[PDB]
């Protein structure tokens, strides 16, 4: 893979500074990646421009352009600003070209490799039941499939901002896409909805999970993330307690309900943001291991490792303050949490080339048979009180 264009751009930030100078590489494989300075010599699809849509604007700043991509079921936007209108032209152009190049090669390849795959549901099929979320480009609502009584989450996006179940992720602890359909003006993703309750609620009612209970949920999270990282080459970047639910049997479900994007007040939950995300530094697989660390700290201590009602002070704590533990935590748990919450992503547990393997080899998870974790052969320490039972 070769560099196709490179140079400085102001990158809009959502957390601290608003506009930050970053040195960006555009590569022929589609990756468009920014760095704090000219970097001196695995790729994540999060940073791909493939199938992007490019738009020019003049607010807030002149000479700004926006890359907009549908990543799985989420519309994400990357906003940028240069000094001259000509500069913008060269960038949007360089980006379109790489992107068209990728579409072209890909279509040619599947045209040539199609194997009698040359073959040829709607709103009314569903009962609305509750808004799960709202955002720039659409909403997420709880629905009941009328024909079956089964409950789903439907993500409803505005089709204009954009313009698949055979391409699902076969991992048990991720949210599966059930159906995907479009209307005259909408694009709709029907995805599983766990009915074991929200882990945030379960944790709240119980005050704390024991180390063995947290170990079970962590193993299942670690397994879902290893899969995202290594099978799909994507970072989740969205790990928080409120995005963890339980299925009927007590196994983890990581939700896929996010819309738009987060971040005086912040438009979401900032207490799980990794340092490098706050600083708009470059980030990779290791941000999800930081979120793991915050989630398991919360499970085993019954409170966040860093909190303040002022997000500014919270941000300071996350970047600067050393982790403190309750007296009742053991050393194996303290070792895992302190390694996952290393502020420098390069020295974080999981931040090396081995990624998830480092975490599964940590002594905290000794004895966990990861093949059995993947196969739901582990026995849940808690069975929610419940199939189509609206208990929660």
């Amino acid at each position, epitope marked *: 893979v070769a560099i196709v264009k490179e140079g400085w751009l102001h990158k809009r930030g959502k957390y601290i500074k608003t506009w930050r100078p970053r040195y960006f590489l555009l590569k022929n494989d589609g990756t468009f990646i920014g760095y704090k300075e000219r970097p001196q010599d695995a790729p994540l699809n999060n940073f791909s421009v493939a199938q992007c849509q490019l738009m020019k604007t003049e607010r807030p700043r002149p000479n700004t352009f926006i890359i907009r991509c549908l990543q799985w079921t989420t519309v994400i936007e990357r906003t940028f600003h240069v000094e001259t209108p000509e500069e913008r032209e060269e960038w949007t152009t360089a980006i379109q070209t790489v992107a068209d190049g990728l579409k072209k090669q890909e*279509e040619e390849e599947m*045209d*040539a490799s199609a*194997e*009698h795959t*040359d073959m*040829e549901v709607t709103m009314n099929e569903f009962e609305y039941l509750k808004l799960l979320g709202k955002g720039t480009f659409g909403k997420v609502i709880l629905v009941k499939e009328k024909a079956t009584g089964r409950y789903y989450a439907m993500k409803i996006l505005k089709k204009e901002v954009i313009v698949r179940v055979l391409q699902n992720s076969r991992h048990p602890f991720l949210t599966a896409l059930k159906y995907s359909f479009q209307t005259h003006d909408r694009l709709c993703f029907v995805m599983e909805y766990a009915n074991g309750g929200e882990l945030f609620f379960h944790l709240s009612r119980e005050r704390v999970f024991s180390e063995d209970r947290a170990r079970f949920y962590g193993a299942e999270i670690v397994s879902a993330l290893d899969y995202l990282h290594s099978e799909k080459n994507v970072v989740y970047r969205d790990l928080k307690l409120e995005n963890l639910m339980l299925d009927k049997d007590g196994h983890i479900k990581i939700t896929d309900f996010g819309l738009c994007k987060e971040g005086k007040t912040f438009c979401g939950t900032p207490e799980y943001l990794a340092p490098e995300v706050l600083e708009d530094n470059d980030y990779g697989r290791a941000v999800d291991w930081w979120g793991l660390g915050v989630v398991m700290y919360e499970m085993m201590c019954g409170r966040l490792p860093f909190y303040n009602q002022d997000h500014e002070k919270l941000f300071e704590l996350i970047l600067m303050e050393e982790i403190r533990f309750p007296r009742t935590l053991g050393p194996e748990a303290k070792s895992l949490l302190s390694g996952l919450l290393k502020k420098d992503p390069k020295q974080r547990l999981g931040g090396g080339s081995e990624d998830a393997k480092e975490i599964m080899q940590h002594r905290f998870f000794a004895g966990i048979v990861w093949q059995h974790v993947y196969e739901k052969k582990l026995s849940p320490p808690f069975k929610p009180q419940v199939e189509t039972d609206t208990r929660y």
Partner: nanobody
Amino acid sequence: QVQLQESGGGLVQAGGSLRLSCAASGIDVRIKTMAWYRQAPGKQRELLASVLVSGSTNYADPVKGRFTISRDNAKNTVYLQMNKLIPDDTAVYYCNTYGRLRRDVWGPGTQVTV
């Protein structure tokens, strides 16, 4: 202009035969799976036959043995030989590539009636 153009339709006495031809201009039939389809007034468009780049053919049951799909690499064209035809064959006939199929792009089609 890149496109596919079907030709060779018309009326024929049942049990007759017909050769439909799909002229790709702007596309390389040699690099693509090509298929033939048909659609009748009240019905959904029906996949009929495919020919992979190797040349491997394949046909759907209603037409197994009666129709043959062939690719003339030299002539950048696909062909569908229609033998021992039936009223239930009456329809508009389209040819297509995988990519155009998934984008719902179609040439003009040619109408056939038994």
